[PDB]
Amino acid sequence: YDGQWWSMGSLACNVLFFCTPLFLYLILQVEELNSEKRGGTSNKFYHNNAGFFHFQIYDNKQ
Amino acid sequence: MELNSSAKEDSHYVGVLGYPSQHDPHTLHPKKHDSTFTKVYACRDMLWDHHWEVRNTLYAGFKGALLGVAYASGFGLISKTVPSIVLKKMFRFVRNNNFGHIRIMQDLLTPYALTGFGLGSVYYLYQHNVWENRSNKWLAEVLSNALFFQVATAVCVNPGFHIYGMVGGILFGTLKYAFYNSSFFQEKESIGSYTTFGDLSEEERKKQEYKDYIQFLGNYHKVRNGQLVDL
């Protein structure tokens, strides 16, 4: 029947499992607050290389 | 055909062009020497005043009620099956009363009209008091519509369809951002148009445009890469 998933097992554990992704995201953001205030690594797509791939062969032809 | 034309208007562009502006007050100013009847009749400008929150709420409620009545006329009533005894009793009422069809229509459309009015009023208040001054307009529309339609589908239709209500709300929010808050098929400006300010001579403007063209040349891949044959 509809909604049996919530009741089956334990409601508290089911809700915790359901909210786990939200907890992970919130923990990541709280951790990133520390990175922002300190100056360490932050959750971003760093672009140090101007599109230059790792150990790529860059050559030209005559 | 445009949706929400007034909101998405370029005041500066219409002003420089001289085009009439939809933001004009649109108000009546009866004279002190005018008749009492004229003074009373000039009060109707409050029905045009767009800053009147009560007026806007009633406007949204009327829109919702009309939509609900249209849905009832088209699909709702025809899909719903009435008991045979109820149908016989109401037909007997029509026979025994003049204009019984009007009262039957009132009875049948009361639920749809009332729910539509409630939805319209609540939606207007929701969108106006909340989400009106958010930064990401697309995200605001998507989230607001998702939540509102989730609740609406849970209540009006069935609590078991709230996920579908939320998905439909996301789709409706994207559609509204596309064609209601934005002008994709309602353009009132030429692409690339601009206005000139300052006392710049035509020679200076032409020189700047020549520089802009030289910069624009770099957009072409062949010229940038130097991969052109000698003509």
Partner: protein, 177 residues
Amino acid sequence: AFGGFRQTDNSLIIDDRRKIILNTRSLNDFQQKIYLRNFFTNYRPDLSSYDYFAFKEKLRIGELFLNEYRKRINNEVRRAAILTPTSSLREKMNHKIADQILDLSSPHVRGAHFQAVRSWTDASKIVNYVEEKQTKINKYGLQFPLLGNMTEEQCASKEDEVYQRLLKEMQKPPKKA
């Protein structure tokens, strides 16, 4: 040819240099390129593609070089621990060595972190440091087999140049004070 994507925002753009006013939704491809998309996405946009590739390689080598400093000082600490008994070990470590260990901490050297968070000024300084070391090495031509490739004629010319430079340096008198 590069193009653009239609904009939906109803903001106004005032270009003081060209003395015109545009609207965000009305911009064409070239106007979008000029006004939007003109931000920088690298430490040194002023450099060409080849120059910035060299800059990127020098920055990577400089990060590795700072990590090498940290590894070398750690190895020296291990050497000190083995050679010197625990008595007087901390007394002798409370010197240049301890200060260098602290000065080569994580903010200054990216040990194992995914990214060394450096502003463009810091990246330029690291590249300049790497280039200073390269200049010092190339003065005497120590980079032929390692950190460089050259032909036989180039090697011979470099040997003659280094010989002349060493002779001149030796003939120079000692620095006063």
